[PDB]
Amino acid sequence: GSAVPFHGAHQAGIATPVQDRLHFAAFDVTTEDRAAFVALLKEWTAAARRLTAGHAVGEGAYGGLPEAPPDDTGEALGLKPSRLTLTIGFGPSLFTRFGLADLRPEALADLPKFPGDNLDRARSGGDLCVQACADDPQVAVHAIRNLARIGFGKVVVRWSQLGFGKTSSTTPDKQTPRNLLGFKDGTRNIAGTEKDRLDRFVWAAEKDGTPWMTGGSYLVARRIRMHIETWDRASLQEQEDVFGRDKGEGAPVGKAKERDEPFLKAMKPDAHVRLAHPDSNGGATLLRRGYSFTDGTDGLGRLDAGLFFLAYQRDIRTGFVPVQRNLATDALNEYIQHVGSAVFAVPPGVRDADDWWGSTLF
Amino acid sequence: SAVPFHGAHQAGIATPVQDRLHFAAFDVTTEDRAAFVALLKEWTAAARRLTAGHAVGEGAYGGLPEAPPDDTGEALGLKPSRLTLTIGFGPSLFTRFGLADLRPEALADLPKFPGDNLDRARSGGDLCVQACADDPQVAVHAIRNLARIGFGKVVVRWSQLGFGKTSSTTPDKQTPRNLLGFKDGTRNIAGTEKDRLDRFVWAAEKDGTPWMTGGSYLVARRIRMHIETWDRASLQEQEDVFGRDKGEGAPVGKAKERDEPFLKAMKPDAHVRLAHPDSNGGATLLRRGYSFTDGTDGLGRLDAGLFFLAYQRDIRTGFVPVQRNLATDALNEYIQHVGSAVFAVPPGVRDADDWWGSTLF
Ligand code: HEM
Ligand code: HEM
Numbered sequence: 001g002s003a004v005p006f007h008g009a010h011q012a013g014i015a016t017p018v019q020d021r022l023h024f025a026a027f028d029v030t031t032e033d034r035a036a037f038v039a040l041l042k043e044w045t046a047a048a049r050r051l052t053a054g055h056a057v058g059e060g061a062y063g064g065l066p067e068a069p070p071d072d073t074g075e076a077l078g079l080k081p082s083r084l085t086l087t088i089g090f091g092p093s094l095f096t097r098f099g100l101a102d103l104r105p106e107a108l109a110d111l112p113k114f115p116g117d118n119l120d121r122a123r124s125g126g127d128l129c130v131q132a133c134a135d136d137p138q139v140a141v142h143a144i145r146n147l148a149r150i151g152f153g154k155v156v157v158r159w160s161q162l163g164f165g166k167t168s169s170t171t172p173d174k175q176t177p178r179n180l181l182g183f184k185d186g187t188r189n190i191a192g193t194e195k196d197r198l199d200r201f202v203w204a205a206e207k208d209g210t211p212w213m214t215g216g217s218y219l220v221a222r223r224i225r226m227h228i229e230t231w232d233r234a235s236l237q238e239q240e241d242v243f244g245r246d247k248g249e250g251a252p253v254g255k256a257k258e259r260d261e262p263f264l265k266a267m268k269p270d271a272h273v274r275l276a277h278p279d280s281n282g283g284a285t286l287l288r289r290g291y292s293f294t295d296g297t298d299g300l301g302r303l304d305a306g307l308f309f310l311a312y313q314r315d316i317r318t319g320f321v322p323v324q325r326n327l328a329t330d331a332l333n334e335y336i337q338h339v340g341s342a343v344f345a346v347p348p349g350v351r352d353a354d355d356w357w358g359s360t361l362f
Numbered sequence: 363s364a365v366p367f368h369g370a371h372q373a374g375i376a377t378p379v380q381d382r383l384h385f386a387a388f389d390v391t392t393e394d395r396a397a398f399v400a401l402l403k404e405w406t407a408a409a410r411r412l413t414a415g416h417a418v419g420e421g422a423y424g425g426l427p428e429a430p431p432d433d434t435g436e437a438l439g440l441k442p443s444r445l446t447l448t449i450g451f452g453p454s455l456f457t458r459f460g461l462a463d464l465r466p467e468a469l470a471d472l473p474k475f476p477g478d479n480l481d482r483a484r485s486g487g488d489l490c491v492q493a494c495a496d497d498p499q500v501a502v503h504a505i506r507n508l509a510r511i512g513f514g515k516v517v518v519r520w521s522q523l524g525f526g527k528t529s530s531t532t533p534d535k536q537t538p539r540n541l542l543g544f545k546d547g548t549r550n551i552a553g554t555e556k557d558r559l560d561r562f563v564w565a566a567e568k569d570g571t572p573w574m575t576g577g578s579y580l581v582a583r584r585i586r587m588h589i590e591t592w593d594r595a596s597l598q599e600q601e602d603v604f605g606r607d608k609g610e611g612a613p614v615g616k617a618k619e620r621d622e623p624f625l626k627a628m629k630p631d632a633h634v635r636l637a638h639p640d641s642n643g644g645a646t647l648l649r650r651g652y653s654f655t656d657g658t659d660g661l662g663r664l665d666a667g668l669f670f671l672a673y674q675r676d677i678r679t680g681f682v683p684v685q686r687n688l689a690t691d692a693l694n695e696y697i698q699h700v701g702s703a704v705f706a707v708p709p710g711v712r713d714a715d716d717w718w719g720s721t722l723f
Binding site: 001023025061062063064065066067068069070073074075076077078079080082122135136137138141145148149152156157158159160161162164165175178179180181182183228232233234235236237239246247248292294295296297299300301302303305 | 389422423424425426427428429430431434435436437438439483484497498499502505506509510517518519520521522523525527528530531532536539540541542543544589590593594595596597598600607608609653655656657658660662664666
């Protein structure tokens, strides 16, 4: 229930241990006033400082003037900080505004069309995003709700996504969670202690060619529907062939323990782990940080399940794109479909109580 | 860490309220009474396993490679997490299997209420399973696997995820707050009150339907909140809507949350005043609902609210009179009922040989 420090060279919510709950919101900007938008950014940062510490935003949830609405909507009163992190990102469409065209980073690449893509334009894109992660879903909702409220008239929510449970790990010393297909997800990720690997693969460096992004990262978000009816009638051998790990232990095929190193030649040629592995992609490596979701039924008598996939990388062109291209022949494609997509530039961290979100850009 | 599955009553009604909810309504697709009884028996065996934290059937792995696993596996390595599984039968079940004359009179259809805007697709249902647990993945895995075992005899009509408190960070006799920011549950029937449970919650044999003795009747209402509207109301408006202050949750004019309300100091259309048993001829409810937030609708608005669950000894003397009295509730300005269902929740599974529905079939 402890707090995660909000200030740093990097934003929390990336290398941070993965919290149990996600509330992800993408916003469109509805003001042309660059000065108004900057004011919003400073205001949102002040609220984030309170929220991540478990304090009410503004002057609190009650005790103000009786005839004025409370500053804080109040549903997180009495709750601990619950490891809340708030991570902000800027979509490519934002750089068409406030005369920011020349500042859009090369590494913020538009994604090409991928085979099987069936993207819903209304749950894709967005001028910016806020990733709220916490162990308590009420805490995450309260944060998004109160940010949107403060931004009323300058931003609106385009689409949002709640994840009821993580399917990723930045802490290999703790139990690896399972996704809704029943497999451990997160074994060979990048850990928050591997500061060398984070520099090489996650944080944008100054020499990369966009100085304001130094210390930031780039985020790919993909909403992926799972065909659980199809999956649930496949044999155990089929399911394990698709991945290249056994279902029970999550060990690479042929080996005994989850964390034994995969021997790719023993896997089927179209096995997910074989195709995604850095060694098959010129060393391309990703920080995976996704969550499971279910949004009711599909109206055809079945549950509707999926995975909200999130990846952080130093350069979308050298991270997500090569690996996703290599999955064109993935055996997993038979059981999933990508139905939403968006990319963001995640700026550097808020360095101290004088700094603010996006200060290096504006 | 676990809640016993067997008893005179089903668990998940008087037992401690768990942090998360996965509620699913099912429609029945078979006409064959025997095939349905067989499914009820299979479901009971699976529920025994799930509530103890074990996989269904012969497990999630280690079986014959050319066979699909009995259990879909996403709860491997998790704990029982206080999972309870509570089944109920909707009025429409009784049009099948020759059961028409066994429908309890207390399982009454709900009137249309002023301001209802009920989504047909998220209403009704031949039966329900309420899955409560401290880990949402444990609850989802239970619904996912019962549906799979039932495939071909039942389909999922609608499903709802909900959250209450998070018990790892929140003390347990701290009242949870709803998404309007007000404490919710202060004056409620507690699981410790055996006498009030008998008076108000459990069906008795003299009520008229012997096979329902020890069961209860369930009303589910999906209630959307107009969040953005609520959040623009003054603090005084919000407190006047309920008749309690927002910070402490004390009845107006009182000092503490648990001070008994003085109804005459509340506005005549305040929610607590209209819902209180003294304003409804003594009618008293066991509320056991959960908040929901499903995302955002087409207008950028927050799709969130209260998934209201009330258990009672007779719908006609429980939910119906109280809800009728809310016709003029000041709260109506900020909420809308958009889904509804009622269910007869049978008596408990007595022992290892018993099964869900045995007293009816
Ligand atoms: C529903 C969609 C997906 C599911 C169920 C899934 C499942 C898995 C599983 C079970 C593993 C093995 C354990 C681990 O090392 O984490 C894995 C590994 C991995 N996945 Fe996926 N995955 C999905 C989508 C994706 C996508 C879209 C990408 C990249 C575009 C990706 C990239 C990777 C990578 C890089 C690894 C680590 C391979 C290694 O280095 O050993 N996955 N995935
Ligand atoms: C979004 C919908 C609703 C919200 C936010 C809400 C909220 C509240 C709040 C804050 C209280 C006072 C604290 C407490 O004793 O629990 C309360 C009391 C109560 N409510 Fe509601 N309520 C809702 C719907 C309903 C409905 C539909 C019913 C019945 C049909 C109902 C019946 C009651 C009862 C019986 C009490 C106890 C009053 C007393 O005995 O002091 N509520 N509710």
